Amino acid sequence: KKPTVSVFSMFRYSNWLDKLYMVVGTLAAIIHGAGLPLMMLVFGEMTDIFANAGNLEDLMSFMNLEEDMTRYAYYYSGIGAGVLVAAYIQVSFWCLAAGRQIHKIRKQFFHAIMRQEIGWFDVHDVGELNTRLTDDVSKINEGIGDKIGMFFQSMATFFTGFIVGFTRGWKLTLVILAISPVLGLSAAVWAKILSSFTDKELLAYAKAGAVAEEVLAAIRTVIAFGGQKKELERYNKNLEEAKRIGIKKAITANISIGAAFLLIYASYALAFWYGTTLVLSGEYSIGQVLTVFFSVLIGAFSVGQASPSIEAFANARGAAYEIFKIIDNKPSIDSYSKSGHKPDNIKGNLEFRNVHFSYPSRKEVKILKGLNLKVQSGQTVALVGNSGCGKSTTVQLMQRLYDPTEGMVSVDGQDIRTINVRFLREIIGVVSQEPVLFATTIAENIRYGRENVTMDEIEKAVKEANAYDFIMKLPHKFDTLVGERGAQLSGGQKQRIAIARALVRNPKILLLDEATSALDTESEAVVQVALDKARKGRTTIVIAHRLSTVRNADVIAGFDDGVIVEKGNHDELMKEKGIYFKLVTMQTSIPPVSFWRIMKLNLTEWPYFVVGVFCAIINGGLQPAFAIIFSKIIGVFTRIDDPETKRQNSNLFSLLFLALGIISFITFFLQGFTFGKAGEILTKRLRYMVFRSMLRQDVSWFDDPKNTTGALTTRLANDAAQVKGAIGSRLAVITQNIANLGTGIIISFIYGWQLTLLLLAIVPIIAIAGVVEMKMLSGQALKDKKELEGSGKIATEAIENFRTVVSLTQEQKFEHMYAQSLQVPYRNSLRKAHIFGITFSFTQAMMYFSYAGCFRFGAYLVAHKLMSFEDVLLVFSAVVFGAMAVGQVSSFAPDYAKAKISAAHIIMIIEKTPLIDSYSTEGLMPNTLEGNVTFGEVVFNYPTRPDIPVLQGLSLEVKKGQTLALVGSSGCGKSTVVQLLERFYDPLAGKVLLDGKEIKRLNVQWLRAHLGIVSQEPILFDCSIAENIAYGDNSRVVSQEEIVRAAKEANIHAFIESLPNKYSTKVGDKGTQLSGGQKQRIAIARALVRQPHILLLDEATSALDTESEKVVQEALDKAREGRTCIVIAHRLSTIQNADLIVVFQNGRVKEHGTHQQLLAQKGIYFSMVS
C-alpha cells in the first residue's frame, strides 16, 4: 500500500539471466530510440540533393540524381535494419524478464498465504486477499514489463532529437524549445488518456449495479410483492448519473486529442515561418530546417510518451509493498514450521487446565475463564449451554487453531505447544455444520483427506458411513463429477460424505461440532446413525443441538458462563437441576442481426448522427490537405522564384497550417460531443428497456441455467454499453477512413500514377504497423487476464474455505496444484513474447524501408522527367502517411464484431414476450376474496429439467378459517405448491380454483398484491427500516401507525425501540446484524402490513437457536388468527396446532384425515413421529 520501497528491492527475484536480459534490453532500447531522430537527418540531406538539382535544371532550361540517391537508399536500409533488430530485442527481452520475475512472485505469494495461520485471515479479509493475488500481481507485471523499455526508448529519442537539433542548427532549436513545455504537457496528457483506454469505468455505474444485483438476486420477492415498477424507477434514477459521467469522459478524451493535434499544427506553422525567414537570409537550408524542426519536435513530443511508465512503476511499487510484507511474515504456529516433537504411539489423554482465551480481533473481551477437563482414552464429552458461552472456541482451540492466553493444553502427557503441527492436525479429525465440498469428484474429495490411500480404504470408509447405496445409485459411481460447487448433491448427502471423508483420515481423537445442523428429520436420524457408528474407539467431544443425543454420554460437561460448572452424566444433572435439565425440559447461437435493425435503435437521435458524420468528413479530409500544403511549401523552395513571392506563399501556407489545426480541434470536439451523447442516450434507453423486460418475464426465465444473476447483470452492464459501438463508432471509423484514404489515393493518381502504383503495395503493411503500435501503446494486449482462470479458481476455492483446508492439512497439495495450473501459460507467454516482438519489429521497420523504396523510384522518375519532387512528396505523404492515419484511426475505436454479438443478445431479450405477463391490465378483480384455494389433479414439472414429474395429480380443498398442514420429505412438492399457488409457474395439467373462479382468468397483479408470503430463508433489502417495512402493500402511501401496530403484532416492537434512530436504521448492513430470529420477525412484520386474506409460510424456523426459535414460533402462531394460512414446518413445531394434515408421497398425496386418525393408525405419519 506504500509506494515508498527501494527500486532495487523490487528486482529481488532477479536471476543472472534476468539481469542480463534487463541490461541488454536497456541497451537495445537506447539504440532503437535513436533511429527516428536520425532518419530525419538523412531525410534532410536527401531533400537538399533533390532541391539543388532542381534549381540547376530550371536554370539550364538530373545527371547524378540517380547515382547520389543510391547512397541514401542504403542509409535508410541501414537504419531500418537496426530497428529490425533493436526493436525485437527491446520488446522481447524486457517481456521475458518480467515474465520470469512475476512467475516467482505469484508462486511465492501463494506460499505465504497458506503459511499464515487462522487469525491472520480474520484481520485480513478473504475477499481482499483474493483480489491482491489476481490484480496486484498483474499491476506489478505491468509496472516491471515493457513499459521500462518504452521509457528508456522515449528518453533516448528525446535526447537524440535535441542533440541533433543543437548540432545542426541551434537558432531554430531554441524557438521550439521555448514552447517545448506545453507540447510536452499536452503529449503527456494524451499519452495518459491513451494508456487509460480500453478499461471499463464502472465507478459511476456501481450505484445502479448494486440495485440491479439486489433486485435480480431476490427476483422472487420483487415479483411476490409487485414492486417491480418501483425498482425500475429507482434503477433509472441511478442510471442518469452514470450517463452524465460517460458523456463527460468522452468529451474530455476528445478535447485532449484535439489539443494535441492543434499544438502539433501550430508548431508546424511557427517553425515553418521562422524557417522561411532563415532560409531567405541564407543561414540555413530547406533540408537543414526540416532536420532541425522534425528532430526537435519529435524529441519534445516523445518526453510525454514516457509519462505512463513512471506512474506504472510507482503503482507497481505501491502494490508490491503489501505482497512483500506478507511474504516476509513468520507465523508462530505455521503448519510448515520445521519438524517438531512427534510421539510414536499416542494413547490419547486430553487435558484442559486454566484455559483463558480471547479472540484476537476483540481480545479486550474474554470468553474463557479456566476451562479444565480430564477426559481419558475411550470416553465421550458433551457440551451444553446457552448461545454465546463459546462452545466452539474450545473446539477450535483443541486442534491448535489458536493459542490460549493463559494456561496449557496437554495430550498424552506432553503439552500441545511442543508438538509437530502436521502430526497434531493429522491425528485430530473434525466435522462441522456446513459440509463444504471441493469441485473435484466425490472420490477425489475423499482422497483429499489423505493422498496415499487406495480405492480399498475409500470403499471401507464409504461402507462405514451411509453412502455405499446413495452414490452407487447415482451415475458414475465413485468418480461422479461434482459440478457447480456440488449442485447435484443436497445437504444431508454432503454431510454423510463429509463424515466418510473424516473417517478416511483414521484419526485418534475425533471432534464433532454441531453435526446435526437440523437436517430435516430422516436425514438427521441417518446422520446420527453414521455419527454413532463412527465413534467406537476414539476420544470425542460431541457438541449437539436440540440436546437429545447428549443424553448418552460419559461426561455431559456444562458450558455455562465461561468455566464449566455443571458436570456428570444425565442422572447427576437431573438431581442437580442445572442448565442441562432446564434445556431438556425446554426441548421436550443467435443469428447475427443486420446493421439496419441495429441502426434503428438509435434512430430517434438522427441529428446527432448527421452532425457527427459531417464532422467526421471534415476531420478525415485533413490529412490529404496537410499533404498538399506540405508539398506546396517544399516546392516553394524547390523552384526558382523571386524572394518576395516565396515569402508571401510561405506565409499563406503557414496560415493554412494554423487553420488546419483550428479546424481539427473544432471538429474533434464536435464529433466527440455528438457521438458520445448519442451513444450514452442509447445505452441508457437499452438498459431501461432490458431491465423492464427482465422484470416482466416470469420466474421460469430466471430459472434457466444460462440466465444466472451474474450473467444477467453482466449483460446489463457490458452488452448494453457495447451496442453503442456498432453504430456511431462504426459510422465515424468508416467515414473517416474513406474521406482520408480514398481522397489521398485519388489525388495521388492525378499527380503521378507510377509512384502511386508502386506505393499501393506497401499500404496494407503500413496500416497494420500503425494498428500494432496503437494496440501496444494502449496496453490492449496486456489488460487481458485469460488462460489464468483455472489457477484463479483453484486459488479462490483454496483461500475462501481456508479453515477446512487447514483443518485437512493440505497446503502442499494446493501449492502443487496451483503451480501445475500456472505452468502452461508461463510457456505460452514466453513464446508470445517473441511473437509480439518480431511482429512489432517488422511492422515498425517497414516504415523505415518505405522511405528508401519510394524515394529511389522517385529519383528515377524525376531523372527521366516524368514528375517533379513536389509530386513525389505529395504522393508519399498522401499514400503512406494516410495509411498510417488509417491504421491509427481504425485501432482507436471499439471492436465491431463484439458490438454486433452483444446487440444480438440485447435485441433478443428486448422483444421477448412471456407467458404469465406481469403487465397485463386485463383481469376480473372482485370485491372480496374468501381465500378458497383448491387443487385438482394438478400435474407439474420443472422447466429446467422436465424429465421426472414433481406433482402427480394433487387433490386439495381448503375453506375460510381452516388452517391446513402438509408434511413430507425435503425437496418435495410443498415448496412447489407454494410457488404454484402464487402463479409463479404454469401447471402443465390440472385445475386451480379460487372461490369457484379459475386461476387462468384472474389478474396477476391483483392476486400477487392480494396475499402475503414469508420466505423460507430470511431475505432483506438494503433500504431503510421504514422503507423495508413499507415494502408491502404498494401503490399506496402507508402511515407509521400501521407499521407500529404490525410490529406489535409481530412481537418485534421491542428490539426496534431498543435501537438508535428507531425506524431509520440502515437494515441489512452497518451493524444491525439481525441474526435469524429478528430477520424472521421483521419478515413476518413486512408480510403482516398488507393484512392478507390468505398467508403462506414455509419452514420459517430451520437453523435457529433454542431461545429465539420460540419467539418466532409464537409470533407465527399469533399471526394466523382468522386467516386461510398454510403452514410448513419442522414436525411438532406447528403440526399439532393445525386442524388437518396432508401427507406427501412422491408428490401425490397419500392419506387425508385429522390428527386423531393419522396418529391412531400405523401410517407413514405415525412412522416419522414415533
Ligand X SMILES: Nc1ncnc2c1ncn2[C@@H]1O[C@H](COP(=O)(O)OP(=O)(O)OP(=O)(O)O)[C@@H](O)[C@H]1O
Ligand Y SMILES: O[C@@H](COc1cccc2ncccc12)CN1CCN([C@@H]2c3ccccc3[C@@H]3[C@H](c4ccccc42)C3(F)F)CC1
Ligand Z SMILES: CCCCCCCCCCCCC[C@@H](CCCCCCCCC)CCCCCCCCCCC
Which residues contact ligand Z (rule: CB under 6 A)?
7-8, 11, 14, 19, 22-23, 26, 148, 151, 309-310, 313, 595, 617, 731, 734-735, 737-739, 741-742, 745-746, 890, 896
Which of ligand Y, ligand X, ligand Z, none binds 362 (CB below 5-8 Å, type-dependent)?
ligand X
Which of ligand Z, ligand X, ligand Y, none binds 391 (CB below 5-8 Å, type-dependent)?
ligand X
E-strand ranges in 979-1131 read 989-994, 997-998, 1012-1014, 1095-1097, 1126-1127
Task: Give yes or no for residue 312 binding ligand Y (CB under 6 A).
Answer: no
Q: Which of 31, 260, 727, 956 binds ligand Y (CB under 6 A)?
A: 260
CB of 745 to ligand Z, least distance (A): 5
* Piece of 7-15, 185-193, 725-733, 748-756 that binds ligand Y (CB under 6 A): 185-193
Task: Give yes or no for residue 888 binding ligand Y (CB under 6 A).
Answer: yes
Phi, psi values for residue 721, rounded to 5° = -100, -15
Task: Give yes or no for residue 847 binding ligand Y (CB under 6 A).
Answer: yes
Task: Give yes or no for residue 767 binding ligand Y (CB under 6 A).
Answer: no
Nearer to ligand X, 110 or 580 (CB): 580
Q: Distance (Å, rounded) from C-alpha 104 to C-alpha 824?
A: 15
* Piece of 15-23, 24-32, 250-258, 391-399 that binds ligand X (CB under 6 A): 391-399
Nearer to ligand Y, 751 or 881 (CB): 881
971 is in an annotated binding site: yes
Geometric angle at alpha carbon 742, from 737 and 748, rounded to 5°: 135
CB of 31 to ligand Z, least distance (A): 11
Q: Which residues on adjacent β-strands are paired with residue 541?
A: 381
Residues in the chain: 1170
* Shortest-Cβ-distance residue relative to ligand X: 391
Q: Distance (Å, rounded) from C-alpha 144 to C-alpha 18?
A: 12
Nearer to ligand Z, 148 or 289 (CB): 148
968 is in an annotated binding site: yes
Total Cβ atoms within 10 A of residue 302: 24
Q: List b or e across 440-459, with b for residues whose CB sees 16 or more CB atoms inside 10 angstroms.
A: bebbebbbbbbeebeeebbe
* Contact between 953 and 959 (Cβ < 8 Å): no
Q: List b or e across 851-874, with b for residues whose CB sees 16 or more CB atoms inside 10 angstroms.
A: bbbbbbbbbebbbeeebbbbbbbb
Which of ligand Z, ligand Y, ligand X, none binds 187 (CB below 5-8 Å, type-dependent)?
ligand Y
Coil, helix or strand at residue 669: helix
Task: Give yes or no for residue 298 binding ligand Y (CB under 6 A).
Answer: yes
Q: Which three cell numbers stand for residue 174?
A: 531554441
Q: Distance (Å, rounded) from C-alpha 204 to C-alpha 245?
A: 7
Q: Which of 3, 340, 388, 742 binds ligand X (CB under 6 A)?
A: 388
Q: Which residues on adjacent β-strands are paired with residue 431?
A: 512
Give the chain's radius of gyration (CA, Å).
Answer: 39
Which of ligand X, ligand Z, ligand Y, none binds 292 (CB below 5-8 Å, type-dependent)?
none
Q: Which of 36, 175, 189, 1046 binds ligand Y (CB under 6 A)?
A: 36
Nearer to ligand Y, 36 or 509 (CB): 36
Contact residues for 241 (Cβ-Cβ < 8 A; gap 6+)? 204, 207
Geometric angle at alpha carbon 411, from 407 and 415, rounded to 5°: 50
Task: Give yes or no for residue 1107 binding ligand X (CB under 6 A).
Answer: no
Task: Give yes or no for residue 954 binding ligand Y (CB under 6 A).
Answer: no
Number of shown-chain residues binding ligand X (CB under 6 A): 13
936 is in an annotated binding site: no
392 is in an annotated binding site: yes
CB of 734 to ligand Y, least distance (A): 14
* Piece of 341-349, 361-369, 615-623, 1052-1060 that binds ligand X (CB under 6 A): 361-369
Task: Give yes or no for residue 759 binding ligand Y (CB under 6 A).
Answer: no
CB of 820 to ligand Y, least distance (A): 40
Task: Give yes or no for residue 393 binding ligand X (CB under 6 A).
Answer: yes
390 is in an annotated binding site: yes
Task: Give yes or no for residue 217 binding ligand X (CB under 6 A).
Answer: no
CA distances from 517 to 150, 388, 434, 513 (A): 60, 17, 8, 9
Q: Which of 726, 889, 903, 1104 binds ligand Y (CB under 6 A)?
A: 889
Task: Give yes or no for residue 259 binding ligand Y (CB under 6 A).
Answer: no
Which of ligand Z, ligand X, ligand Y, none binds 617 (CB below 5-8 Å, type-dependent)?
ligand Z
Which of ligand Y, ligand X, ligand Z, none binds 305 (CB below 5-8 Å, type-dependent)?
ligand Y
Which of ligand Y, ligand Z, ligand X, none binds 1135 (CB below 5-8 Å, type-dependent)?
none
Which of ligand Y, ligand X, ligand Z, none binds 177 (CB below 5-8 Å, type-dependent)?
none
Helices (H), 697-753: 699-703, 709-714, 720-722, 728-737, 743-751
Site string for ligand X, 106-135 (x = CB under 6 A): ----------------x-------------
Nearer to ligand X, 831 or 1070 (CB): 1070
| Breakpoints of the chain, after residues (C–N > 2.5 Å) | 61, 588
* Contact between 307 and 188 (Cβ < 8 Å): yes
972 is in an annotated binding site: yes
Which of ligand Z, ligand Y, ligand X, none binds 301 (CB below 5-8 Å, type-dependent)?
ligand Y
Query: Could you give the dihedral angle defined by the CA atoms of residues 1031, 1034, 1037 and 1042, in that order, rounded to the nearest 10 degrees?
Result: -60
1153 is in an annotated binding site: no
Q: What is the DSSP secondary structure assignment for residue 408, as one 8-state letter?
A: E
Task: Give yes or no for residue 387 binding ligand X (CB under 6 A).
Answer: yes
Task: Give yes or no for residue 302 binding ligand Y (CB under 6 A).
Answer: yes
CB of 848 to ligand Z, least distance (A): 24
Task: Give yes or no for residue 361 binding ligand X (CB under 6 A).
Answer: yes
1125 is in an annotated binding site: no
195 is in an annotated binding site: no
CB of 253 to ligand Y, least distance (A): 11
CB of 106 to ligand Z, least distance (A): 19
Q: Distance (Å, rounded) from C-alpha 951 to C-alpha 1142?
A: 14
Q: Which residues on adjacent β-strands are paired with residue 953?
A: none
Any idea which residue has 422483444 for its cell? 911
Contact residues for 585 (Cβ-Cβ < 8 A; gap 6+)? none
CB of 48 to ligand Y, least distance (A): 18
Question: How many helical (H) and strand (E) elements, i.e. helices and strands, does the chain have?
Answer: 49, 18
388 is in an annotated binding site: yes
The dihedral sign for the CA sequence 309, 314, 317, 322:
negative
- Which pairs count as long-range contacts for 177-183, CB under 8 Å and 24+ apart, including other chains? 177/296, 177/300, 179/267, 179/270, 180/296, 180/300, 182/263, 183/263, 183/267, 183/297, 183/300, 183/301
**Max CA separation in the chain (angstroms):** 133
CB of 739 to ligand Z, least distance (A): 5
Task: Give yes or no for residue 516 binding ligand X (CB under 6 A).
Answer: no
Task: Give yes or no for residue 1100 binding ligand Y (CB under 6 A).
Answer: no
Which of ligand Z, ligand Y, ligand X, none binds 742 (CB below 5-8 Å, type-dependent)?
ligand Z
Coil, helix or strand at residue 980: helix
Query: Could you give the dihedral angle defined by the CA atoms of residues 882, 883, 886 and 887, in that order, rounded to the nearest 10 degrees?
Result: -140
Task: Give yes or no for residue 359 binding ligand X (CB under 6 A).
Answer: yes
The binding site comprises 385-392, 968-975
The binding site for ATP comprises 385-392, 968-975
Interface positions with ligand Y (CB under 6 A): 36, 39, 187, 190-191, 194, 260, 264, 294, 297-298, 301-302, 304-305, 773, 777, 847-848, 884-885, 888-889, 892
Interface positions with ligand X (CB under 6 A): 122, 359, 361-362, 367, 387-388, 390-393, 514, 543
